[PDB]
């Protein structure tokens, strides 16, 4: 019959967040995950900067990295995922919204903040 391709968002409205911080390419943020076990749900704090943001709807994702014991680990996270907590502390100064080059660049990979 009559097609919308817009009701996708309407049915995705059932899972939305009402805070939604800003993230483009340089936000130094620590993210918390409510890891659920049989008892005493743990709260993990994972810090790092964001490389690039991709999204169309509920499918909104961002990147975040840590470096512990010399080993770096990078993880993607969907924004509208429950059991996740985001608390921003630094806004950075970047040139392009899509950057990925920390994968190769060595130590002292930090970036100056947005003055």
């Amino acid at each position: 019959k009559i097609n919308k391709q817009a009701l996708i968002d309407l049915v995705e409205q059932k899972q939305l967040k009402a805070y939604v911080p800003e993230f483009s390419a340089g936000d130094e943020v620590n993210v918390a995950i409510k890891l659920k076990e049989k008892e005493k749900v743990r709260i993990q704090n994972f810090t790092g900067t964001v490389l690039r943001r991709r999204g169309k709807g509920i499918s909104e994702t961002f990147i975040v990295r840590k470096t512990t014991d010399g080993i770096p680990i990078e993880k993607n996270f969907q924004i509208h995922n429950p059991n996740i907590s985001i608390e921003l502390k630094r806004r950075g100064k970047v040139r392009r919204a899509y950057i990925s080059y920390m994968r190769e660049r060595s130590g002292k990979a930090a970036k100056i903040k947005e003055r």
Binding site: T68, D69, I71, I73, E74, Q78, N81
Partner: protein, 122 residues
């Protein structure tokens, strides 16, 4: 993606330097490596003051893969190295110091000695 003939690292202090996968456990040509899977390796480089010397064939478990894998929680984690932990024919590992990150897809598989002796769980 990570498989046979892959010189990987070691995530443990065992007096070894370099090790290569020799075969993957599993029937009907598994031929692929995934996180938490028990595999068999052979040391290629090791220190003279270590427990193993080159030519020894041992069994290990991959802890970190360069490509990583998607987790059932709905998130996917990427690693930046390829390391394995050595296990001495039982549920106890060969080593005595687990340093660095380790995959969480192996907690339900047992081998909790590494988990309790791990510096961190991710």
């Amino acid at each position: 993606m990570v498989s046979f003939m892959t010189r990987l690292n070691v995530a443990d202090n065992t007096g070894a330097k370099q090790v290569g996968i020799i075969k993957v456990l599993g029937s009907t040509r598994k031929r692929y490596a995934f996180l938490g899977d028990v595999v068999v390796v052979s040391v290629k480089d090791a220190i003279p003051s270590g427990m193993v010397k080159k030519g020894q064939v041992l069994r290990a478990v991959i802890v970190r893969t360069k490509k990583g894998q998607q987790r059932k929680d709905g998130t996917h984690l990427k690693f930046d190295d390829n390391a394995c932990v050595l296990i001495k024919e039982d549920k106890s590992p060969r080593g005595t110091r687990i340093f660095g990150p380790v995959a969480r897809e192996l907690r339900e598989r047992g081998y909790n000695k590494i988990l309790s002796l791990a510096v961190e769980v991710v």
